[PDB]
What we know:
Two copies of one chain form a homodimer.
Chain A: E1 18-22, H1 26-37, E2 41-45, H2 52-57, E3 62-63, H3 65-71, E4 74-77, H4 81-92, E5 101-104, H5 108-111, E6 122-128, H6 132-140, E7 147-153, H7 159-169, E8 177-179, H8 182-197, H9 199-214, H10 219-228, H11 230-248, H12 251-264, H13 267-281, H14 284-294, H15 298-308, H16 311-321
Helix pairs in contact in A: 1-6, 3-4, 8-9, 8-13, 9-10
Bound molecules: NADP nicotinamide-adenine-dinucleotide phosphate and magnesium ion (2 copies).
PDB class: isomerase
Keywords: Stereptococcus pneumoniae, BCAA pathway, ketol-acid reductoisomerase, isomerase
Assembly: dimeric
Amino acid sequence: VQMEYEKDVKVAALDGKKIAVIGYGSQGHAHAQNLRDSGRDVIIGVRPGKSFDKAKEDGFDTYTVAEATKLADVIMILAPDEIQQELYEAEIAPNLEAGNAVGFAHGFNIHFEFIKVPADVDVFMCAPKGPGHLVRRTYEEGFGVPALYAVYQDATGNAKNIAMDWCKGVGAARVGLLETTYKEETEEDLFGEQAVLCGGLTALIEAGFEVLTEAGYAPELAYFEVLHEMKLIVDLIYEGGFKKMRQSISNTAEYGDYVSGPRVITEQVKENMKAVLADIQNGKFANDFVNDYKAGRPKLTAYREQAANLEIEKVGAELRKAM
Amino acid sequence: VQMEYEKDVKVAALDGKKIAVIGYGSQGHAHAQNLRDSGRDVIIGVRPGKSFDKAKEDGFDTYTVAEATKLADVIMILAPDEIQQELYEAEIAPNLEAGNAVGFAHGFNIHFEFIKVPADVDVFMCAPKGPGHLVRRTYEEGFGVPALYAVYQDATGNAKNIAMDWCKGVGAARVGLLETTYKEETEEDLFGEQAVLCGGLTALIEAGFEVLTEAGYAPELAYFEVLHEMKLIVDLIYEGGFKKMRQSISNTAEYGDYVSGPRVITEQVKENMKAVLADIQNGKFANDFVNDYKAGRPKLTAYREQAANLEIEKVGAELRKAMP
Ligand SMILES: NC(=O)c1ccc[n+]([C@@H]2O[C@H](COP(=O)([O-])OP(=O)(O)OC[C@H]3O[C@@H](n4cnc5c(N)ncnc54)[C@H](OP(=O)(O)O)[C@@H]3O)[C@@H](O)[C@H]2O)c1
Ligand SMILES: [Mg+2]
Ligand SMILES: [Mg+2]
């Protein structure tokens, strides 16, 4: 795959389209605001009222989801993944017309087929590689967040151009687009956040914190050693890969990196990651997530309360206040 | 342990002291410049070369290491771990006097006793938690970088005040100080970078990249999902802990974090980390590093050439090129 930019957006397919953004949270506010600034005709569809109000104070024509959908040619669904199916069936599906296009910023519901959009309606995706605040902030600074785009079903023959023009309208084409599929986006995105970015990383940090504090080292000092000082390291990797990071740290640190990294992340850990990937591919994780929501979020409830009680989180809150 | 600030620096112990900074790399430069703008009296000692004349052109009275040490009451050694011992024995040790204070910004050589300073000389530490350019820049902007301080041996009774006043001089007390010991600073610093920050992290990213690419997913896309996107995640944790990060990500991502993190980092991984800590505490890692260095860095050489061949590094350099 080769990276694409504004010059690669052959057709301004959002030209003459009424656009409805559904929802107004992390991604919702960012997409709507960026597209508006880009000159697109954008309305908001959302439930009352604390996303509804902010959207109307931000100057948007704000309707119910059903009304916004009925008015629109292009409908981008930016409600939480767990509620998209019920919301789609009740409020969106009845108000679609042939030739419409439905968009997502993550392929979960379409790929796992919790949602099935009619055959005469396009389904596309623009998936920015950052939360909404960054998607918005970078845009405002004349910049952007790179994005993936994909098409799940192309009824009109215009679906790919709609996806790429959406990317352009939100600023992503300023810095780089990569084409993918709904399957690849969904599976790689779930895997990355689970095994490495969020799950893997927080568990790694917490394990390191436990080993130090259980060994008798001060938690305040341990906080810096496994969390606070991570930002400088990851900024280096972001800028110049492992190469730049390892050039920048001391030879003692670099040698420790090479020797101890493989002691910690072993072949068995890689097999653990393969099991995580398997449950993404086979629909188990997806069903577990949706089933937790349907049951009243009991697992998410226990996890959130557990995470609130972590010593590293208590200590870190105190230290970040003291700085 | 409670964080300390400028109000907790009880004695201006560097008052009237002749301060020599050994080394004029980013670290040496930062400490020296900061102390000068804070109103202290600093000279630089370093071998002849680029740094020597940059120091001379920076306005510092610049000498060799031997002569800077001779003139100074307080000698801060800011050179790489691997050259400190040779440099100390040859140039510094024969020029120390009773009542002097020797400083370090990391405890490796003093803790593992590759260097033994005479018992009528103080040994202290100020260890800012950032690289030289950041220590300088933050100070120039009017704040600083937080720091640990410690004392290994106190002959004069002034060693702790010297350490804390040094911290104050380089701007660290503006933002926060934590007292530690040479042993704990050294062991925690080695452990953190080995098990979590550098070793664990790069190995985690690489394993994830391998799992995706071996399963047939595109490497360019995998680069974003295990490496590029980590920066904003860690930025969030830096600013607001796991809590802020998990608020920003989708509920889908957050649930995946809670469920899958423990499947990847298991009890056995924690035991692996305990083994890493053990080799730090028992001197085995320290000896292995020094022995590799004395032997011409053969392990370091093989490791570096292997790292240069990683697919994620080749794909990544190309993508970062494509994203100015
Ligand atoms: N969050 C990220 O960083 C991120 C990154 C990449 C991709 N994505 C994807 O983008 C999509 C949305 O993510 P998100 O973080 O923006 O979710 P979010 O933070 O939970 O935002 C949900 C928004 O939709 C509103 N809402 C709740 N129920 C609604 C309903 N029936 N009808 C209309 N609006 C409703 C919410 O208003 P209330 O507050 O009043 O409930 C809120 O404003 C997901 O598919 C996600 O995978 C997210
Ligand atoms: Mg992800
Ligand atoms: Mg995601």
